[PDB]
Amino acid sequence: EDWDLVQTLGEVQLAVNRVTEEAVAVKIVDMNIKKEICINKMLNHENVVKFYGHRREGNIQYLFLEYCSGGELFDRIEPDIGMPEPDAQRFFHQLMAGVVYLHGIGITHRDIKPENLLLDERDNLKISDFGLATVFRYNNRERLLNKMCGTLPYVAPELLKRREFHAEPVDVWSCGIVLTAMLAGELPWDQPSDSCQEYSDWKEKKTYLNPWKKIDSAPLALLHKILVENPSARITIPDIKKDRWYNKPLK
Numbered sequence: 191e192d193w194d195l196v197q198t199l200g201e202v203q204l205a206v207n208r209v210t211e212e213a214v215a216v217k218i219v220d221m222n223i224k225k226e227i228c229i230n231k232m233l234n235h236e237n238v239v240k241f242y243g244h245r246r247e248g249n250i251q252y253l254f255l256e257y258c259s260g261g262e263l264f265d266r267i268e269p270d271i272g273m274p275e276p277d278a279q280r281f282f283h284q285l286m287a288g289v290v291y292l293h294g295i296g297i298t299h300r301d302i303k304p305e306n307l308l309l310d311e312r313d314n315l316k317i318s319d320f321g322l323a324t325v326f327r328y329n330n331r332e333r334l335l336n337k338m339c340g341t342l343p344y345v346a347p348e349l350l351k352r353r354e355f356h357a358e359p360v361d362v363w364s365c366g367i368v369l370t371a372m373l374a375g376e377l378p379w380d381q382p383s384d385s386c387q388e389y390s391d392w393k394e395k396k397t398y399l400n401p402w403k404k405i406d407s408a409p410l411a412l413l414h415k416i417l418v419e420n421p422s423a424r425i426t427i428p429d430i431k432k433d434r435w436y437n438k439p440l441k
């Protein structure tokens with residue numbers, strides 16, 4: 191109770207300790223929360239929102255989390271424009287670092303989007319909100335996912351047409367949609383279904399349409415590898431790390 195809740199960040203409130211003046215974010219949820227807490231405890235990476243502690247008072251549960259003064263990545267995207275390629279690439283590298291770490295401890299976020307990618311004072315990206323995250327590897331054994339989870343414009347196509355599916359290619363897909371957003375300042379489709387004209391157009395290689403026309407050939411080639419319908423053919427992270435644009439030096 192040494193923390194004063196200065197303002198509502200998003201419920202999540204900015205909290206400043208009276209003694210140290212340290213600033214953290216506090217997630218206030220009145221009663222899923224248990225799993226989020228469990229998952230958070232496992233996490234320790236420079237590109238994932240740090241979990242400090244939790245305190246439960248009565249029916250109210252408090253989660254203490256790293257405060258990112260930068261705010262969300264979503265705010266760094268100019269509509270219809272995106273952001274400078276060098277900034278996009280840097281955010282993308284940090285995003286891959288975060289995801290590689292999560293997948294490495296068998297955890298999938300399941301809702302990767304710019305709203306859930308926060309920035310600190312140095313504009314370092316931090317993966318945020320593990321309320322929908324789940325274990326997909328335990329005791330070295332992979333568990334396929336069955337629950338439909340996410341945000342439609344970012345979800346992989348298999349999630350909509352498959353009874354069960356691999357967790358990793360789904361997170362790669364959403365990262366691809368985030369990259370598109372950063373480079374084009376717009377989302378390619380409402381959802382990845384054939385009833386969706388925009389998705390159908392992409393599967394037909396109509397890259398003279400937006401948002402594809404706005405994207406340079408190098409990053410677009412990477413997007414051609416990520417936004418692949420067949421999750422088995424989809425490029426994996428180790429291979430993304432070998433992509434030409436990924437490795438291209440930028441201003």
Ligand SMILES: NC[C@H]1CN(c2ncnc3nc[nH]c23)CCO1
Pocket residue numbers: 199200202215239255256257258259261262305306308318
């Ligand atoms: N989408 C992120 C939530 C929570 N949020 C946050 N802002 C700053 N630091 C945070 N740490 C966790 N959530 C944070 C503001 C934006 O809404």
